[PDB]
Design a protein around this ligand. Sequence first.
Ligand SMILES: [Mn+2]
Length: 600
Amino acid sequence: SHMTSATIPGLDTAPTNHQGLLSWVEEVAELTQPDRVVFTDGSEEEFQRLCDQLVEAGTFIRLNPEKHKNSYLALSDPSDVARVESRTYICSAKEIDAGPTNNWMDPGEMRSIMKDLYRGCMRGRTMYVVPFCMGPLGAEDPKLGVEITDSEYVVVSMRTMTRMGKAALEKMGDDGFFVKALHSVGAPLEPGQKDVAWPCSETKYITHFPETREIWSYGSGYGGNALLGKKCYSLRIASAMAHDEGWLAEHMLILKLISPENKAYYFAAAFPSACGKTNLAMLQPTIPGWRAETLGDDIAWMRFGKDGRLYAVNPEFGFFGVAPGTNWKSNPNAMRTIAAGNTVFTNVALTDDGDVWWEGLEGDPQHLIDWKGNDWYFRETETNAAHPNSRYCTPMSQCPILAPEWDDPQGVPISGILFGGRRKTTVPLVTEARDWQHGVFIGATLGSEQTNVRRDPMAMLPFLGYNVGDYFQHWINLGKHADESKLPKVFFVNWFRRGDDGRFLWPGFGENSRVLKWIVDRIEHKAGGATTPIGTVPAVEDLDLDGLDVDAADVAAALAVDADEWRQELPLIEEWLQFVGEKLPTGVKDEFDALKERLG
Ligand SMILES: [Mn+2]
């Protein structure tokens, strides 16, 4: 029954221009034994064809086209609802090169385990070969990939999340380099066996081989486990490339802010989860003459341009956002983007009229079907209607405030890099770094509230493709060798400081634009601030609070730098720097010492 690649259907009609790709596809098909092989072209006719099959398989139902044209709801297996960090591996030749923020295993051992799993794993299934491009195709060195997958769901979402298909394949030419990304849901089928809507396995690996730029995923069909451009390529493999090639692959939103001068400023901002970064990516300023547009709300790739400035590009093509919490009052621009359809929803609730719902959304629906397919009732059912990690997957191009520069292969010049976290105490509403190296330290020690303070350096804690210490050194190296006058200024923002009584000291949301105005003015040298031990921090009088009904004492409190509180912060930072291990750069330890000395 085992078939040689040459006789596997679809391989006789395979594209032959690129021999390395073809040989690789043949090797893989020979191992996994799919029923047939399909090279995807990313066309609209292909998209509707795959969707028809997804509807037939029960993976998708078609949402009411009158509310979301060309849109679908998928409900997953309850065991497969999120990225699985403990099953995610960086398999560098040496463990130290994975480092303490990563899960390591010897690459020889990992390959032996996974190749065993892959043997015959696609029996009964179509194997798709999915070419794609991370970033605009017109780029200089475009980052190409090919995902092999046995998941039709994966193919369709990859079409939205990356520039997938014909164009990317042609960009590969006849011998062009590309990231080899392999994926299987690990649910082989017998001939004639009825499949399930959402195949997956209890056994999962999301493995990265940094030296060869390869990704091997098995067992999950969900999000960042299976859409291999999303985190695997965009951050983990890309950070390794960026390390070797002198650029930065980062977990940052990209915001375009326009002043009453009609001058545009571009910012890259890194937050961990639970800091409302999507709200910031799609900011609507509350002060006259200021406007904002978005270039992305997840990944930014930054590279020096001819003029010595850092330019950011969004390597992705779609939004893959967390649904719950998204609503008209807090994020009308996200809702408008979703309203235009072409969206795949995963694990949200279904309304009686074929619309969708999730916790946080307006409407008070009286009855819903929940993410497990069961009846749900307003003010009665005690389980969430949508899964807390449910998703919408939507084209970026239909966002109403998308900046026209979004698809420019050169990217946009970055004036400011922002780091942020949630802190009840200690950390001011906004701080500017003293210089680049201080800024690196500010990013490297990014703290955010956990169940107590979790350190999530540059918001990259679960996403680095190599040693966190070397990563800090890389940041240090890029600044050292740059024109200092051209580097982005670095800031730390905390929208979430609280009074002792638990009040929010800063109203946030749209009012965050007032902080961004200060940031713009600082960049233009048009604003002052206090020189504190932790950096430059504005006083209330430095901020534009005009038109804002707020207690000035609350804003002063949000901006305070208390030396006692920061002396208590020091051993927390010190413990983290020790955890960074032997690769902790001296330049980062220097900034710790300098901060400790300035505090006294
Ligand atoms: Mn993310």
